[PDB]
Amino acid sequence: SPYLITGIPKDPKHPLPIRKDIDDWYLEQRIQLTLFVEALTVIQNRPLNDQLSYFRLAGIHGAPWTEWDGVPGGQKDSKGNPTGFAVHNNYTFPTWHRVYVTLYEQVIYEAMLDFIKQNVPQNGKADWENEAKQWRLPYWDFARFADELRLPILVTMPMVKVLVPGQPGKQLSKPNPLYRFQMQTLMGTLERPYAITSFDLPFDKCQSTTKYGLLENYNADVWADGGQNWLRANLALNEHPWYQNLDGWDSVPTLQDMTFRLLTTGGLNWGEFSSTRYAPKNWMNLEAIHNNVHNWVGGFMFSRPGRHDLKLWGAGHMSSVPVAAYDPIFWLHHCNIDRLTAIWQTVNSGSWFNDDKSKVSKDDDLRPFHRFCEKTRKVVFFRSDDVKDWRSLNYDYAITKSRIRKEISDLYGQRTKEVYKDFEEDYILSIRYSRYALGGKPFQINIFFGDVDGKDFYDARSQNFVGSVFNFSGVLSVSQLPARLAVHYYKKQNKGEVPTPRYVVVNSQGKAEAEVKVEVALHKTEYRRVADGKRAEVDDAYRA
Amino acid sequence: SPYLITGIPKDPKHPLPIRKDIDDWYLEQTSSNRIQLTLFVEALTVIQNRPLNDQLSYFRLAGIHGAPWTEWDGVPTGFAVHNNYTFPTWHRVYVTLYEQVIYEAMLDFIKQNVPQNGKADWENEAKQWRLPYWDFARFARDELRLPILVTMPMVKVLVPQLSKPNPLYRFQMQTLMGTLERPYAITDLPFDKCQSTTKYGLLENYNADVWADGGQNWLRANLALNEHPWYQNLDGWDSVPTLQDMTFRLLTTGGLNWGEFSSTRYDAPKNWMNLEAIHNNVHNWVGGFMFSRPGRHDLKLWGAGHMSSVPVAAYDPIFWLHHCNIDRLTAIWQTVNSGSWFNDDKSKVSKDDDLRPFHRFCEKTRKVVFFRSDDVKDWRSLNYDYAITKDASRIRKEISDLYGEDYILSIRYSRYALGGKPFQINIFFGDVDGKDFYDARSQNFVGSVFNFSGQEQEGVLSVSQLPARLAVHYYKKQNKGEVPTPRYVVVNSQGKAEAEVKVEVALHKTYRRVADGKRAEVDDAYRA
Numbered sequence A: 001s002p003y004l005i006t007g008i009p010k011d012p013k014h015p016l017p018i019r020k021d022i023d024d025w026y027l028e029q030r031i032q033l034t035l036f037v038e039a040l041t042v043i044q045n046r047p048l049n050d051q052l053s054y055f056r057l058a059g060i061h062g063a064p065w066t067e068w069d070g071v072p073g074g075q076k077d078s079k080g081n082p083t084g085f086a087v088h089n090n091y092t093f094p095t096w097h098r099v100y101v102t103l104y105e106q107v108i109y110e111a112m113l114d115f116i117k118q119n120v121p122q123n124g125k126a127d128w129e130n131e132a133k134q135w136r137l138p139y140w141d142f143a144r145f146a147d148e149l150r151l152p153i154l155v156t157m158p159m160v161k162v163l164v165p166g167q168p169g170k171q172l173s174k175p176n177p178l179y180r181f182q183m184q185t186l187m188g189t190l191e192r193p194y195a196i197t198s199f200d201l202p203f204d205k206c207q208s209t210t211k212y213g214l215l216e217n218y219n220a221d222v223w224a225d226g227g228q229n230w231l232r233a234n235l236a237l238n239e240h241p242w243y244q245n246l247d248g249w250d251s252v253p254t255l256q257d258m259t260f261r262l263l264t265t266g267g268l269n270w271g272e273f274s275s276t277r278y279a280p281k282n283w284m285n286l287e288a289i290h291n292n293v294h295n296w297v298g299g300f301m302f303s304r305p306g307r308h309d310l311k312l313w314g315a316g317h318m319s320s321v322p323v324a325a326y327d328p329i330f331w332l333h334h335c336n337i338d339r340l341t342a343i344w345q346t347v348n349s350g351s352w353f354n355d356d357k358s359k360v361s362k363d364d365d366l367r368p369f370h371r372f373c374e375k376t377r378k379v380v381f382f383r384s385d386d387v388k389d390w391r392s393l394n395y396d397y398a399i400t401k402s403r404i405r406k407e408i409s410d411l412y413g414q415r416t417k418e419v420y421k422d423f424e425e426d427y428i429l430s431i432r433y434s435r436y437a438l439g440g441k442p443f444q445i446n447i448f449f450g451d452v453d454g455k456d457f458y459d460a461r462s463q464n465f466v467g468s469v470f471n472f473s474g475v476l477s478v479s480q481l482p483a484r485l486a487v488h489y490y491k492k493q494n495k496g497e498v499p500t501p502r503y504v505v506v507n508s509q510g511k512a513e514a515e516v517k518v519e520v521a522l523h524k525t526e527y528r529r530v531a532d533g534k535r536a537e538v539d540d541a542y543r544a
Numbered sequence B: 001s002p003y004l005i006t007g008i009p010k011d012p013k014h015p016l017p018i019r020k021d022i023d024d025w026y027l028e029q030t031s032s033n034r035i036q037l038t039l040f041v042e043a044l045t046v047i048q049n050r051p052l053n054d055q056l057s058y059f060r061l062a063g064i065h066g067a068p069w070t071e072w073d074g075v076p077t078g079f080a081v082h083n084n085y086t087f088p089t090w091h092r093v094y095v096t097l098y099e100q101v102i103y104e105a106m107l108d109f110i111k112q113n114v115p116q117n118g119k120a121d122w123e124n125e126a127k128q129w130r131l132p133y134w135d136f137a138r139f140a141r142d143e144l145r146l147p148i149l150v151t152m153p154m155v156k157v158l159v160p161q162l163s164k165p166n167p168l169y170r171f172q173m174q175t176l177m178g179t180l181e182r183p184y185a186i187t188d189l190p191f192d193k194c195q196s197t198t199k200y201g202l203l204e205n206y207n208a209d210v211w212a213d214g215g216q217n218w219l220r221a222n223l224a225l226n227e228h229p230w231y232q233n234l235d236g237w238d239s240v241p242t243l244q245d246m247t248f249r250l251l252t253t254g255g256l257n258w259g260e261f262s263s264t265r266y267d268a269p270k271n272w273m274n275l276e277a278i279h280n281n282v283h284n285w286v287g288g289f290m291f292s293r294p295g296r297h298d299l300k301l302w303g304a305g306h307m308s309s310v311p312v313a314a315y316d317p318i319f320w321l322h323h324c325n326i327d328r329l330t331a332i333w334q335t336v337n338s339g340s341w342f343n344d345d346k347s348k349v350s351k352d353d354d355l356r357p358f359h360r361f362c363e364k365t366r367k368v369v370f371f372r373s374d375d376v377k378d379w380r381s382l383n384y385d386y387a388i389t390k391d392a393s394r395i396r397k398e399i400s401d402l403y404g405e406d407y408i409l410s411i412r413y414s415r416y417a418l419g420g421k422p423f424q425i426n427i428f429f430g431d432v433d434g435k436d437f438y439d440a441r442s443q444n445f446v447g448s449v450f451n452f453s454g455q456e457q458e459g460v461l462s463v464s465q466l467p468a469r470l471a472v473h474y475y476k477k478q479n480k481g482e483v484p485t486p487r488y489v490v491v492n493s494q495g496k497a498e499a500e501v502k503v504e505v506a507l508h509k510t511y512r513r514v515a516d517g518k519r520a521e522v523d524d525a526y527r528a
């Protein structure tokens, strides 16, 4: 039978339960924690031929590009480009992923019920079923201060203590299914047709998902499980201009600034908000922010030229669209992207596929996700209008359940406001590029104000770095970066002059790509364009 | 009981088998017939899963060294010898104990898992296997590194093929070590809140549940292991890892007596480069000892772990691989200093100390007695060897191949300067950054001395030596030829500077003292 995606079934006793912040949810805890851990462990341990195994569910998103729920799987097109179900660089990006997250949530809920049926004693039946019915997939608030932004506590824990129903007072420390996804062998040697086999990282050599764990110049057996370098990921997540590392300047995490802007800027239409797909004012979009977070969580650079004692590179699944869904944090990230969509919808209530560009895609089938159309009595694919109201999938968020503008400021606008207040003008960077510029491989666009260090053009530790744009998806693509504070620093160092944005396109070997076109400009409001960007050159040894 | 320690029994098919470099061995084993690798993985797994009342469980064998300070083998401060001249010999017997237990567990594994017609092949491999050593001072297969196998969470083994958790990656118990059953509970750093050993995994500003298993930050460990002067960070200067230089010097410098070579104990200065001091820094570099740092930092390079901590270091499986190489360095030095064995007025006293709790049978009396140092002067009597000492005629050239005006830093300190707590003495040439006085990334950093401890015997202090030739050469070039006055900072586990700690630091040149060290002030928020 087709798998009909409904969201968790509606119980009068459980009216629109909320998806909680995963750090809040964990800190308060332990039946729901036990349920989620036990259910997800079962799901991750299902066989490859079980379509509701974790592997096959993550598989929907990308590699290994197989069928799912009876829907033919993908393949490389005539361009040489892998074709799968997930939508990137198009206006259905938020709605495709809305249904995807709901699928995952529903499968977990059903495994929770099966866990209760097999493991909980009569005394505890109804309480445990009650918690299953109130549970919803937690979100990771990547833009909320945990002083700094952080990966969820639970994601950084290799083991988690759970309850043992029937043995009161007894708890067990179990492998945490949110920490990593581990298979029984290297993903490159799975049974056909499931092997993860173009990609520029050795994901065929991984048994487990990893964050920053893949580096060139280590034994290939290290890549089987490169570990969870969550401290490194937290560092990347707190990216900000380089000058803010100097004494006497305050910092603001660029991710939080971007998210505050995304949620509070008015006058965007759906097409502008929903996607990177292409007034530079309106280029700050959901998908661009989501792309940078993918990069910062997983890492995308496998190597770096030269010799470096401190090694800040390292690659991992979340930066790679074909395999990102295997990392258990993928779903928590997309749960928050769904939350951000709901928030924006709530404060932009008429802007639903409302422009001439996105209207073309409004009625796209969101394959492979089935539902029953009661009006025609047929099994059909989800469409974006079916999930316009996320509440018809029987979940909500606290923030979307009157005080939403205040809550946005309180969660994402306090630091920005505090530091900006020290300086009444805004500056932004516009960035436009082609996701195909490097034959489909990912790349990072880094922008600098002032001289670029030809051996160090990578991150917030690089002299004069201002911000990055990550080409996750591998028509054009756009993004936007805050630039106000970095321009102020530059003006201070350079007699008030406005800086020329300088950019470098960095590939997964940490080298600069000279023929990837990027259009970068600096804009000002008391927006007008005030400087045109230029490519910076790097050292000979660092040139692709 | 008693458990008689003998080394692996002699087998005429296996004359004096060598303890191999663990990276070479792992590549031999994987580079399909991985029988020795399977044997070591499976046997150490079984040993790690033995119960606490089994004195041959991993926990109890590690417990000999320090916490939780219980009996072992009927023998009622840990047993481990530190800051004394029996440091190399006590640990020689300890490593042999570990190796023999694993071998016996290998035989058990074969009896349990190998079909009858395969047993001879598998037994042949067990009998050839010896505990591999970690060559912490050899460039790994550009830089020094933790062993390949220590950095792998999972390892593929034969089923007499299958991926299994790697018992060399961590030691994991089923509960937090603070809650174990009396008397075994591990109850400074929150080691009671650990279920697993960790490298750099304990940081203060994170949820305590993170500490249950702080992970294996092996990239950070590798960075520490490659410690060298800050200036070698700059374009386009060449770098030399201090650990490799120290090791080359330890092995090639003639004229030390056993007392000088064997220990940090100080009851001149050119002779303060000793085995125990190098071993101490490696402990720090593998595990990390700083739990916190004051002030605002984007890049967080601190974090603490078991290997930096005397009472719990033996729980980390790399402990044994590190001590295997310390034993190899002893054997190399013995080979090139053959007349120097507890043979000076200082160390002679300690030679007949019983190496408790380790039992052996005396053939002269047919009694069970304790090991003494002279019983293991010849390590081959324990039926193992090292390639480098089995072929001794070339030893000088191999040492050079592997690890190879002079200026040296001398450092004399009390292990109990902070009441027994660990600390790191960092030395600088030039101005010190009052908010960054910690490592190779800190401006003008030259090198560190780690106090591996956790009051000192009257009249007893500790010494170490650091290479300084390249660092002085740089500072003079950059500073109008000025010979640098060494500046020191004594750093505690909170990343703050301990000003009420007196250390004796001095710069010597070919040796004559040419400069006296001074304590560097740091920012107020960074002062202990």
Ligand SMILES: [O-][O-]
Binding pocket: A088, A321, A324
């Ligand atoms: O979007 O993954």
Ligand SMILES: [Cu+2]
Binding pocket: A061, A086, A087, A088, A097
């Ligand atoms: Cu996606």
Ligand SMILES: [Cu+2]
Binding pocket: A290, A294, A324, A334
């Ligand atoms: Cu995504």
Ligand SMILES: [Cu+2]
Binding pocket: B065, B080, B081, B082, B091
């Ligand atoms: Cu010891």
Ligand SMILES: [Cu+2]
Binding pocket: B279, B283, B323
């Ligand atoms: Cu030691």
